[PDB]
Amino acid sequence: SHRKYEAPRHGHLGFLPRKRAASIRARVKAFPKDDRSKPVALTSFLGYKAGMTTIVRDLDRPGSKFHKREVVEAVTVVDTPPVVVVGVVGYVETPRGLRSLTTVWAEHLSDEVKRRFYKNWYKSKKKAFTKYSAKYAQDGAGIERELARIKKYASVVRVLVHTQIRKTPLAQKKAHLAEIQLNGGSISEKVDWAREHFEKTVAVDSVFEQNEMIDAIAVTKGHGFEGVTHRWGTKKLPRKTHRGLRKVACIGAWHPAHVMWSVARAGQRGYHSRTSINHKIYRVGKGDDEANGATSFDRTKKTITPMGGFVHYGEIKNDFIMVKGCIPGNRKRIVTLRKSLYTNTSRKALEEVSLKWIDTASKFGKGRFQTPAEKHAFMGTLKKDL
Template sequence: MGHRKLHAPRHGSLGVRPRKRAEELTPRVKRWPEKSWFDILVERLGNEAASQGVVARPVLLGFPVYKAGMTHAIIVEDRPNTPVTGKEVFTPVTILDAPPIVVLGVRTYIIDEEGYLKTKGEAWRSPYDAIAKAFEELYAGIPLIGISVKDVVRKYLHGLRKVNHGLVKPEPSSEYGFKFVAESSESELRDALSGEIADVRVIASTIPVLSGIGKKKPEIIELKIGGGSIDERLKYAEGILGGYVRASDVFMEGQFVDVIGVTKGKGFQGVVKRFGVKELPRWHKHRKGSRKIGARSPGFGTMSEPPQAGQMGFHRRTEYNKRILKMGLNGLEITIEGGFLHYGLVYGPYIMLKGTVFGPAKRMLILRHPIRPNLRWLPLSGPKIAYLSLESKQGI
């Protein structure tokens, strides 16, 4: 078996062990970038970025979306120094449903004695007005959505109570049948935003009632605010507290983002499908079985390295530097005929990503400003889309 590594490298990365199921569908963002995409453009491109209206400002470093489906497009390649620069090229695209999020709370952090972040304080606001305003400004003119403002708020509060009983309580006498009881006073807000603060984050909630999924239970996530000084971040956080934020307020067309989420589950699989191990013909050396790895030696408490059968898929993963080709407010302009398979229609704001994204339809993903961007090429706008296929994908 000399020089075997040169001809048969190991199957499966050891960097993603253990390959176990994710704890929950809502992914946790383990790290946030030091600079937002806007800060990088201003720092690297200067006046060129300013001429395009790009300014360094406080901004949320992440945004939750729902995967709707895929189609394909013909774009004019704008990458420099390639054989196809300026020519029309084919590319698969992923459509993400991006309904606005509502900022329920603001949380500030300090550095403790051991150098770790410690919660200093937090303040909460009622989401009634934000949800109603978001619906009226983004969805009221769409006849196909078939739902009123009152129904949107009522379904959202009903789902929010299922997620966290401490935020919403039933109140049959109220307009919506529920009451948001976690609202903080003005003094609590001042206490949370004053003093020595090391980090500022918001507690945001999705509004899945406005998506094509049709579910009521929202996801509650914590998003970091980046860009500017701490005082500017605090002022920005106070400004969006109790309001709604669109994807276009967080990202821009042409930029790169990281995608964080949970992959499609495959269940318990063997080594051939799970790791791509080659299945050898049955002969004397392994006459007792095929599609097996043979001896693997005792582990003695260590994590096993040889390929073994086990869980495949439903893992938390991160894909780096996926490019945003287009963003818009009317999802019906990019919805394919008959709707996306296993999803339906995209009614409101959307994001079109170049290439594929892991996970099945309806899976919630978090888009994050790039943590390891390619600094050799920093586009200021998206490419020209010459053609977008809106043909039905049923039966394909």
């Protein structure tokens, strides 16, 4: 017979399969539509998720109850040290899809970037790009010819850049290499932009800007093998259920004599690649500046790093990106930040944001103070003090 009472589904059928992602770094499967009018610039960036915090900002939305009144929101902080442009690759369109035809690398590579190419760096001759380096030492023989080959073809040009993992508190010691499509114009100019940037760094402030509407692309937090009840949010069976109750009672009818692909079943949860859209940047921090957490109303010399450092991460000595909301992926994970695909007015994507105060209290518990100067001022002197 039919279902006694109609109820919506559980989970999302468009997010299958819920298997582990291919790699720890999520891959950007689409880039903003290119217009050959603006100057050549990146369309994405690489960063690391440090942690979340609490921000206080005066909401400005005509008609709303809290218009011109104070609200409290939670944002996540992403450490974004500048990346190094090492190598560009061109893509020629084919009736079978886009295909890379050539790759031109930089003459010199840092130690951290080439560690990606070795599964055992400690016992190795470290002969990476050594003979490719010999392609240089002549003016332009083997390289400029390849660059010209890219110019004559390769309607889409992407740039290979790698993070400076040594600048982060992580003990990773291995860089992350990724591609970013350039959305300037006159692809001949695109490769000129890339070649001039070989062995050169690019700061995050040259890509993203305050109040800009961006997107986050990262692999979520894995959780191993998971029961059906929590993997899909199904109803728990009654208490007096034999042979367990954290299950799904009926997984299919007699016909078809198979288990449907749309029935919730136990399997690995998390560690999937996700693309979270519509996240608004609030502050573009600069590592070469104290008082990172100081607003025009706070005016206290305190960095974005809380007391005792970010939980499980450390400090934010580098430039950082802090975006409203929460982005997928846990702390210490590589995260790729992307420009918005389409222009969105929405009267909230055009909102101008100016912060008031940053919660720098220690996240290792119910923190009370914001600065050891304040802590000493409040508690007074102690036995440890002389």
